[PDB]
Design a protein around this ligand. Structure first.
Ligand SMILES: Cc1noc(C)c1S(=O)(=O)Nc1c(N2CCC(NCc3ccc(C(F)(F)F)cc3)CC2)c(=O)c1=O
Ligand SMILES: [Mg+2]
Ligand SMILES: [Zn+2]
Lengths: 153, 248, 199, 1340, 69
């Protein structure tokens, strides 16, 4: 597709060789594409550069330090808030496979252990229905003018 | 879904669908850009592949997952759920287990059950029974009383336990005697006490064997455990008329 | 091995004695593991084939049944007649050694006083109703099955005899040993033998 | 006798004398690692051999080269303890010197600029402990040795079953250490084939054609040529008289005016002898004879210049006429003899599709890389990088030696890749075996199964880390810059660090050490596994390899192997067994020169052994070394019978060399059935260490060597006298002789205290020597968990009686007197680590704070200002340990709740309680708290208080050591200055530091003093250099994972008593779960009134034929008996001589034993110490197969005034009346295995549910539910339980609505279920509808 | 053979449980099969009472009511 575009914008009359002119346009559509569909969770272009850049600074300091650089070391090389690195590193991870088999090599997969947190407990579901019943007994005990006015507020 | 440490996890479908979606849109685009036949056929061929991989990865080159070497699981593979194949079998509420020991005092129809286990099991029965007898104000109130293990709840527990039997199961369940019902006798300890005559059917020793326990919630089930699964009814074997409840 | 372990356990077993004792043991253990795994695979296949099989009819009323005799192998009986008939319902009324006097009528269930009545008389052959014989479509007739239960009576409607049948067969399967558990597997699988005989 | 021995000598039985003792049990692990990490100046395996293999790395003809110099290991960042405390790895950094050379273009090998780049860092490699463990992430871990097929060539059969004809085919496999496989196999029709790896089958001449062999030359290789001549007219044959063996004559074979064999008579050994003596070399033959005889080389008509016949093409009568009129005097046929020299290569050539060298190369490329277009460069380069490139293929010497040995060569070392000859000869062999001569080797045999361990396995992983870095360097030298870059820019430590870390971390052969027992440790290290990389999987093999092989004898244990699904794939190593230099198992033997048994040891391979005739250990020989009997039982070649006196070439080293260490610790083994032995040997390992170390009265004699070699115990480095003892440390004033000239020396040994083990038990040490005791080199200074005074003590001895007690010992269940639970003797201590993690979430950060919502003062009162529980605080289930809070605002409450917020007017929280609290049920004492904060993040109050206490503590130990060391140096000086210049009173009147200022007359004493001064200041300097480092480690911010702000780890020590449900067992494979704890009174008691501690069922003895457990009970009775007699004399305080006489009587009992004893031992100070140590019972050793006989036991019973029966009359404590019959009583060593009921019990009402499948799941302490499978479903189906089944897998599981509607009814008091559909199906529906399938729910 | 015998089943649901699921499912689909239930396993999966035992009492009632008035 990057080729399909070099052909339209081409001008042979400029005496430019088609074999290198297209090389720019093909290489442009490829690397722009990786930026959009290679990730499960899409991140913007400036974010990918930032990331690649940090693996370059890490390379330099890897044997330079003898071990490896501290999270706030690379931070200094970089013009940015330097703490942002923690945020960058976290988003840049890419999801792990839910069907990744866990230990014992059993059909026991990762997802099987992710518990549901959005759900409401049964022990709780009861107390709520019970709070309805209890506030009613209390409201009906009051005077009718007082109950209707409370239920409105 | 999110995890801890800010890590993320996803089902392999999302990867696969993404491939369909991407190749489908790349093709939609080439139709207006008026691409040469070689490319659209190539794209039409790729779209066939992504779809085939979504539905049943395996009848082709079998696409592998993101970075991970292992191949991704397609819809057809989630329909099975047993890689011969795995037996089971689902996980159940109101259920417990532990090491089994002896218990010569028992009658045929009863079993020994730890105090602690019993409590946590019948919890909801107990909660209602307290507030039905006016010991607790509300449910939240009972919740705490049983948390404190107040002396009065031990009395209440003996009540929800009276005519309510439990079921006991041993490792491989070969014949229907693998599961049998018992009236629970309350025990201090953490060990399940089993009747010596019933060991035979279960194939149980006390060399460290373990058994699970299940509570029959609904009423029909209570009776189904009193009329059919109750230890006393299964006195003879169904494989051959001879009795299985045999002095060991 | 020609020279056997001459010593016993009150005695001490020496090195070559134990070393040789070993193989027998190790094979044994492995052997039980496998025989445990294979007994279940059978039952699984067994319950698959039965499963849906339930006592539906009360009585299909057929007279067709199989013929029961004691097994009698070689010299003397390997399993007596009484056991094979006990608890089965009769296909047609059998008679004493001299006829005109029927001891047991058409479809009576043969129990303990009856068997003792068929043992008091020299009776040696009985035609009995069977599930294989039973006409009943989609199910088994109550009468054709028999009685056996943990209860001493005739089988009740709606019990899944199929499942219970399966269970019964593969459960003691662990104890078993051409022959053994694999032979059993071959019989049910209806396998043609290597060198068959034509009739 | 040595200083620790002198305290308590165990009486040893058994005649046989130990000629060779037990070698350092953990040798295999510690020797292996050493070779990998050792600086070797040759090609022997190691990091050096690793570098030498992949280096140099030269650019694609770019003539820029990077070369290896040497490596180095810097000292670790943290020590072993810091590593475990912090929670990281113990490793040394790898600094390697590399040289980059740039070459001139164009000069013949002239270098432009070379940079000898300083040692670049290419990762850290973890290090091995003195015990052979690796700390991986603060956890001790073990790398199990692997047992695989040895590299080289091996020939197999696969008889009968292949095609069911019966025939048997023959395969040959060439398996290298690294590289592709090459298989040669016969088809049913006798044609030869080949397959690289396991790929498609191809005809075997194609590979020769690929090596540049024409049809003519291949036929020239394998077959012998037969020469035909046409002298005068029509035929004549060159004859070799032997050729005609196994053939019947077809024509009249007459020669030299004489007839030897008439037409139709079989040429036999007679016709061959006659022609041989006569010297018959040419005989006349008929034209018709060469109608089938195949021609070897091509033949052409000179005149026409056309081909008459091609090589390997059958001759016809018309064809014969054609090459004869074209004037051809000779013909080369093949010698095709059906039985002896089969024409298999000749018939394969006919199957062969290819014709030349390229044609072959192409075909092989097309198999290996199918579908893709084959080029010429490709096909040639592919074939060369399969078997001939040093990079892609290496047989290794182990393999090279084995390969040459199987082809029967003179060499033992050659190349790493295959020569043309190697491939050819292998074929030539496989063909002999089909023809006859030759036997195939079996896999199971231990000369063909090799053994690999840690060091080599890792050297293999480091090679893989290099081959992938090699890729980066080549890729970089490609775009090459000049003298700007350096070998540092291009070498990336991460893939190197990643790969080594994976191996030690996640690996099948690496797992957490079995640390619940010192046998558990030592046996784990000695584990063998057929599993893992380069090894078979459980499902692939195959009972033949699982089973016990004859070559196992004395190399592996026949019994210690798991009951599980991998029986015989594991196994434990034999005691005396070692690893051969090439890597094979060899067991030691005694040399029998002529008729005398030398005391020289010879180690023998599985194959060396096969030849010689070896005498049993169980033999009788006296005097010089002569066999008592003329006929002695011996094993020779795989079988064993009776043999001649002067005939044996060797004899077994010991009674115990056939078993493993864990097996050698079962007394009276001989009397147990192998089946039950196997289980006990497995069960001993699972024993938890008791509260008080007992020691067995009934032992075997290893118990000590086992405890010493495992580092649980603390042993003497040098010998001297104890300067200070303390629950904390032990200091030894070294003896001058053992000492070093300079730097004096006083060894200080620091004891390990109350710390956690891998199996959450308690690993703790204790000082066994008391102040001012003389110690020898190699004596126990301290004991470890489950070790008593040097001996292994996994359990405790109990007074036991065998009889049925009203069914409380029904199946295997055990009955125990409260007296055991009172004495706290089977009590065992457990330690737990519980961490609170403070992370960063999107809603904000988590706070570790004392201020928590909805909590009573009383709850919070257990926490400090920060919110972290106090050290020493006794906690129970539910109590908050670390107070944590997770940010969560804008709740959005219901109107009923909103009403409640106006009434009681409580302020709502923007925070959730996420505090760590004691798991439900467990209850112990907090014993330590550790905080780890992210670097840069501010330390809280508690965090710092801890840093302060540590620094103080660090400075104290540091200084105290230096102080004792100062005195040790200055004391050495006072003695050196007095020997030539004595001023005994004059010396100590001046300040100790001003002594260094005194010289001495011309002597080496002036040099010694110089040495002590020098060592004095190196100490001063090191103390300061250590205090700096120690200080830094305390202050520095621990590196935490992403998201996590800080972590609080609480260590909880729970004391678990012993209750019903707990599992217990003896050494002879007797399982048992304690059934009921009983009162002291009810116990069966004997006439004296002394009750039994444990009542056992006697029915578990006839069935489970473990009879040795009975002898344990009788010899145990006799044992304790001797102690009671001594305790009696001790109490009456008789006298030194009276006690001496009886004791000396005891150590002599049994007759002709190897024990030996006094009187030499000092009547007082010495004898009384032993006496006291025996009063608990007299420790006795029963060697494995050299045990104590019934008689000896009965006599030891007689000496304790006890019955010979071993049976006593007993009375029930309940009725007071006698039990009819006498019951066996005595003492049996019993264990507590960690299967405690406390851990096992579980229960759940309602709880948490999984995200995908709405199915019970446990997390918040509250465990998941039980699994109700198909099998159990069948059970309910079998009963009529239709409702029991419905509620079971609907409302009690997948039914997201019904589950709550039930819970709601139950509390309301309604036993009704409203079923509805399970999610499990409901999901299926959506899943298949998302295929193109429409599934619907029909009808009303 | 039981293994072959078990293969024939009216209830495609019960079929998919043990046989090859793709195959069962493909074939049922083309055909437009209708599982009427009436069998043990198939009801368990779908989650209603078993057509035997206690449930036998109810299932017998549902069956006559079906295709009736
Ligand atoms: C427990 C238990 N023990 O035995 C039974 C049976 C149970 S259960 O009733 O709970 N059913 C259960 C499950 N699934 C999911 C897998 C599915 N098998 C293939 C399949 C059948 C029918 C179709 C259709 F035709 F409906 F589309 C598709 C796919 C069978 C149902 C489990 O998992 C599981 O545990
Ligand atoms: Mg057991
Ligand atoms: Zn019938």
């Amino acid at each position: 597709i990057g080729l399909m575009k070099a052909v339209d914008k081409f001008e042979y009359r400029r005496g430019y060789k088609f074999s290198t002119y297209a090389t720019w346009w093909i290489r442009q559509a490829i690397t722009r594409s990786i930026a959009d569909q290679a990730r499960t969770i899409r991140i913007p272009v400036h974010m990918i550069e930032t990331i690649n850049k940090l693996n370059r600074i890490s390379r330099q300091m890897l044997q330079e330090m003898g071990r490896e650089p501290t999270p706030e070391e690379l931070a200094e090389r970089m013009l940015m808030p330097e703490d942002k690195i923690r945020k960058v590193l976290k988003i840049a991870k890419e999801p792990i496979s839910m069907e990744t088999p866990i230990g014992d090599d059993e059909d026991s997969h990762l997802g099987d252990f992710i518990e549901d947190t959005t759900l409401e407990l049964p022990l709780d579901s009861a107390t709520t229905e019970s709070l309805r019943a209890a506030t009613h007994d209390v409201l009906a005990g009051l005077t009718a003018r007082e109950a209707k006015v409370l239920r409105m507020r | 879904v999110p995890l801890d440490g800010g890590r993320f996890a996803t089902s392999d479908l999302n990867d696969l669908y993404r491939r369909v979606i991407n190749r489908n849109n790349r093709l939609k685009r080439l139709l207006d850009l008026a691409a040469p036949d070689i490319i659209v056929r190539n794209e039409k061929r790729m779209l066939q592949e992504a779809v085939d991989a979504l539905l049943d990865n395996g009848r082709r080159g079998r696409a592998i997952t993101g970075s991970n070497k292992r191949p991704l699981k397609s819809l057809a593979d989630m329909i099975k759920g047993k890689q011969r194949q795995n037996l089971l079998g689902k996980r159940v509420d109101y259920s417990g287990r532990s090491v089994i020991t002896v218990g010569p005092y028992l009658r045929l129809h009863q079993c020994g059950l730890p105090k602690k286990m019993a409590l946590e099991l019948f919890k909801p029965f107990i909660y209602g029974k307290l507030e039905l007898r006016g010991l607790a104000t509300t449910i939240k109130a009972a919740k705490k009383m049983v948390e404190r293990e107040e002396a009065v709840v031990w009395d209440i527990l003996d009540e929800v336990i009276r005519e309510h039997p439990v079921l006991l199961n041993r490792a491989p369940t070969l014949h229907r005697l693998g599961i049998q019902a018992f009236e629970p006798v309350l025990i201090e300890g953490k060990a399940i006490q089993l009747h010596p005559l019933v060991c035979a059917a279960y194939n149980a020793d006390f060399d460290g064997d373990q058994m699970a326990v299940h509570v029959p919630l609904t009423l029909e089930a209570q009776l189904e455990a009193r009329a059919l699964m109750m230890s006393t009814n299964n006195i003879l074997s169904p494989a051959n008329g001879e009795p299985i409840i045999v002095p060991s | 091995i020609e020279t056997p372990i001459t010593a016993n356990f009150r005695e001490g077993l020496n090195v070559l004695q134990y070393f040789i004792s070993t193989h027998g043991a190790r094979k044994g253990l492995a052997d039980t593991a496998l025989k445990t795994a294979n007994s279940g695979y059978l039952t699984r296949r067994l319950v698959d084939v039965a499963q849906d099989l339930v006592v539906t009819e009360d009585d299909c009323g057929t007279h067709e049944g199989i013929m029961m005799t004691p097994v009698i192998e070689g010299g003397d009986v390997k399993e007596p007649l009484r056991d094979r008939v006990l608890g089965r319902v009769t296909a047609e009324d059998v008679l004493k050694p001299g006829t005109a006097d029927i001891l047991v009528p058409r479809n009576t269930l043969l129990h303990e006083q009856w068997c003792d009545l068929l043992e008091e008389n020299s009776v040696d052959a009985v035609k009995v109703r069977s599930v294989v014989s039973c006409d009943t479509d989609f199910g088994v007739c109550a009468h054709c099955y028999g009685r056996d239960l943990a209860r001493g009576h005739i089988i009740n409607k709606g019990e899944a005899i199929g499942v219970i049948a399966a269970q019964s067969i593969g459960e003691p399967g662990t104890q078993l040993t051409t022959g053994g558990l694999p032979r059993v597997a071959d019989l049910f699988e209806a396998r043609r033998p290597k060198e068959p005989a034509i009739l | 006798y040595s200083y620790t021995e002198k305290k308590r000598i165990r009486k040893d039985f058994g005649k046989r004398p130990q000629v060779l003792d037990v070698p350092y049990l953990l040798s295999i692990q510690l020797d292996s690692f050493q070779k990998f990490i050792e600086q070797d100046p040759e090609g022997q395996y190691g990091l050096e051999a690793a570098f030498r293999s992949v280096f140099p790395i030269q650019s694609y003809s770019g003539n820029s080269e990077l070369q290896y110099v040497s490596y180095r290991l810097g000292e670790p960042v943290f020590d072993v303890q810091e590593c475990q405390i912090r929670g990281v790895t113990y490793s040394a950094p790898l600094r390697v010197k590399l040289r980059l050379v740039i070459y001139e273009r164009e000069a013949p090998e002239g270098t432009v600029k070379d940079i000898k780049e300083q040692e670049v860092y290419m990762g850290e490699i973890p290090l091995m402990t003195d015990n052979g463990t690796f700390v991986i992430n603060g956890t001790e871990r073990v790398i199990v040795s692997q047992l695989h097929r040895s590299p080289g060539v091996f020939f197999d059969s696969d008889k009968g079953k292949t095609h069911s004809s019966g025939k048997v085919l023959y395969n040959a496999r060439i398996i290298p250490y690294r590289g592709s496989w090459l298989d040669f196999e016969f088809d049913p029709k006798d044609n030869l084939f080949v397959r690289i790896d396991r790929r498609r089958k191809l005809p075997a001449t194609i590979i020769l054609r690929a090596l540049n062999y024409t049809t003519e030359q291949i036929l020239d290789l394998f077959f012998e040529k037969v020469i035909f001549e046409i002298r005068d007219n029509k035929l004549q044959m060159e004859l070799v008289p032997e050729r005609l063996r196994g053939e019947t004559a077809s024509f009249d074979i007459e020669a030299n005016g004489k007839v030897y064999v008439e037409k139709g008579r079989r040429i036999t050994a007679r016709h061959i002898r006659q022609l041989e003596k006569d010297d018959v070399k040419l005989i006349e033959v008929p034209v018709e004879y060469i109608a089938g005889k195949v021609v070897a080389k091509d033949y052409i008509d000179e005149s026409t210049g056309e081909l008459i016949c091609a090589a390997n093409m059958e001759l016809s009568l018309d064809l014969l006429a054609k090459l004869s009129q074209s004037g051809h005097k000779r013909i080369e046929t093949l010698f095709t003899n059906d039985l002896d020299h089969g024409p298999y290569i000749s018939e394969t050539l006919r199957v062969d599709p290819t014709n030349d060298r390229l044609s072959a190369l192409v075909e092989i490329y097309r198999m290996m890389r199918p579908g893709e277009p084959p080029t010429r460069e490709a096909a040639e380069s592919l074939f060369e990088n399969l078997f001939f490139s040093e990079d892609r293929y290496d047989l290794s010497a182990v393999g090279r030696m084995k390969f040459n040995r199987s082809l029967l060569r003179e060499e033992i070392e050659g190349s790493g890749i295959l020569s043309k000859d190697d491939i050819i000869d292998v074929m030539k062999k496989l063909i002999d075996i089909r023809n006859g001569k030759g036997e195939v080797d079996d896999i199971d045999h231990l000369g063909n199964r090799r053994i690999r361990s840690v060091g080599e396995m890792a050297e293999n992983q480091f090679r893989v880390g290099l081959v992938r870095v090699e890729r980066a360097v080549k890729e970089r030298l490609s775009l090459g810059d000049l003298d700007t870059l350096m070998p540092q820019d291009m070498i990336n430590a991460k893939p190197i660090s990643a790969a080594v870390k994976e191996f030690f971390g996640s690996s099948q052969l690496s797992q957490f050490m079995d640390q619940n027992n010192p046998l558990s440790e030592i046996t784990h290290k000695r584990r063998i596994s057929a599993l893992g990389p380069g090894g078979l999987t459980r499902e692939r093999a195959g009972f033949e390899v699982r089973d016990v092989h004859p070559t196992h004898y004395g190399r592996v244990c026949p019994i210690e192997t798991p009951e599980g699904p991998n029986i015989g794939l594991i196994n434990s190593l034999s005691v005396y067994a070692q690893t051969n230099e090439y890597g094979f198992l060899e067991t030691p033997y005694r040399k029998v020169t002529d008729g005398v048994v030398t005391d020289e040891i010879h180690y023998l391979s599985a194959i060396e052994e096969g030849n010689y005739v070896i005498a049993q250990a169980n033999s009788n020989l006296d005097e010089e070394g002569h066999f008592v009997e003329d006929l002695v039982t011996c094993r020779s070649k795989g079988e064993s019978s009776l043999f001649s006196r002067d005939q044996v070439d060797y004899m077994d080293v010991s009674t115990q060399q056939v078993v493993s260490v864990g097996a050698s610790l079962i007394p009276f083994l001989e009397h147990d059935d192998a089946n039950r032995a196997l289980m006990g040997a497995n069960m001993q390992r699972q024993a938890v260490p008791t509260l008080r170390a007992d020691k067995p009265l009934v032992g075997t004699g290893m118990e000590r060597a086992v405890a010493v070699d495992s580092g649980v115990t603390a042993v003497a480095k040098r010998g001297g006298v104890v300067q200070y003892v303390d629950a904390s440390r032990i200091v030894i004033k070294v003896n001058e002789d053992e000492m070093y000239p300079g730097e004096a020396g006083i060894d200080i040994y620091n004891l390990t205290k109350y710390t956690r083990s891998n199996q959450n038990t308690c690993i703790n040490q204790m000082p066994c020597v008391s102040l001012g005791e003389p110690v020898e080199r190699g004596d126990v200074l301290a004991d470890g968990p489950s070790t008593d005074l040097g001996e292994l003590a996994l359990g405790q001895n109990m007074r036991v009686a065998f009889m049925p007690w009203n069914g409380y010992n029904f199946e295997d269940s055990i009955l125990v007197s409260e007296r055991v639970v009172q004495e706290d003797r089977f009590t065992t201590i457990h330690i737990q680590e519980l961490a609170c993690v403070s992370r960063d979430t999107k809603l904000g950060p988590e706070e570790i704070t004392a201020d928590i919502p909805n909590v009573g003062e009383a709850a919070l009162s257990k926490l400090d200002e920060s919110g972290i529980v106090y050290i020493g605080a006794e906690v129970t289930g539910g109590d908050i340990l670390v107070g944590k809070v997770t940010p969560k605002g804008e709740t959005q409450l219901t109107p009923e709740e909103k009403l409640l917020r106006a009434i009681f007017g409580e302020k709502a929280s923007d925070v959730k309680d996420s505090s760590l609290r004691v798991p439900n049920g467990v209850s112990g004492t907090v014993i330590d708290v550790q905080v780890f904060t992210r670097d840069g993040v501010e330390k809280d109050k508690r965090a710092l208080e801890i840093e302060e206490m540590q620094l103080k503590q660090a400075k104290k130990d540091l200084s105290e050591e230096l102080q004792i060391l100062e005195a040790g140096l200055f004391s050495r000086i006072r003695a050196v200055l007095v020997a030539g210049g004595v001023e005994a009173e004059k010396l100590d009147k001046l300040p100790r530091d001003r002594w260094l200022e005194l010289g001495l007359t011309d002597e080496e004493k002036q040099n010694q003093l110089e040495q002590l001064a020098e060592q004095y200041d190196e100490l001063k300097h090191e103390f300061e250099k250590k205090l700096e480092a120690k200080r830094r480690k305390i202050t520095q911010g621990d590196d935490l994972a992403p998201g996590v702000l800080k972590i609080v780890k609480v260590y909880l020590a729970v004391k678990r008593r012993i209750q019903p449900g707990d599992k217990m067992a003896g050494r002879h494979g007797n399982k048992g779960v304690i059934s009921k704890i009983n009162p002291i009174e009810d116990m069966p008691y004997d006439e004296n009134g002394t009750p039994v501690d444990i009542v056992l069922n006697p029915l578990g003895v006839p069935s489970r034929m473990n009879i040795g457990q009975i002898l344990e009970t009788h010899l145990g009775m006799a044992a304790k008996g001797i102690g009671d007699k001594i305790n009696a004399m001790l109490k009456q305080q008789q006298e030194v001589a009276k006690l001496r006489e009886f004791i000396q009587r005891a150590y002599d009992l049994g007759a002709d034993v190897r024990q030996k004893v006094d009187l030499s031992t000092f009547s007082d100070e010495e004898v009384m110490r032993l006496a006291e140590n025996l009063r608990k019972g007299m420790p006795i050793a029963t060697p494995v197969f050299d045990g104590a006989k019934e008689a000896e036991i009965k006599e030891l019973l007689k000496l304790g005034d006890l019955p010979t029966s071993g049976q006593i009359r007993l009375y029930d404590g309940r009725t007071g009346e006698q039990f009819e019959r006498p019951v066996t009583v005595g003492y049996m060593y019993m264990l507590k295995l960690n299967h405690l009921v406390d851990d096992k019990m579980h229960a759940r009402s309602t709880g948490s549910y999984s995200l995908v499948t709405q199915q019970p799941l446990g997390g918040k302490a509250q465990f998941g539910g039980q699994r109700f499978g198909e099998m159990e479903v069948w059970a309910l189906e079998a009963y009529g339980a239709a409702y029991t089944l419905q509620e079971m897998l609907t409302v009690k599981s997948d039914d997201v609505n019904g589950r709550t509607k039930m819970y709601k009814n139950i509390v309301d008091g309604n036993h009704q279920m409203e079923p509805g559909m399970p999610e499990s199906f409901n999901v299926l529906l959506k899943e298949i509808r998302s295929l193109g399938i429409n599934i619907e729910l029909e009808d009303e | 053979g039981i293994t072959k015998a078990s293969l024939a089943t009216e209830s495609f649901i019960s079929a998919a449980s043990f046989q090859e699921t793709t195959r069962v499912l493909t074939e049922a689909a083309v055909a437009g099969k209708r599982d009427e239930l009436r069998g043990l396993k198939e009801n368990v999966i779908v989650g209603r009472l078993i057509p035997a035992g206690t449930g036998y009492a109810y299932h017998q009632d549902r069956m006559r009511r079906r295709a009736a008035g």
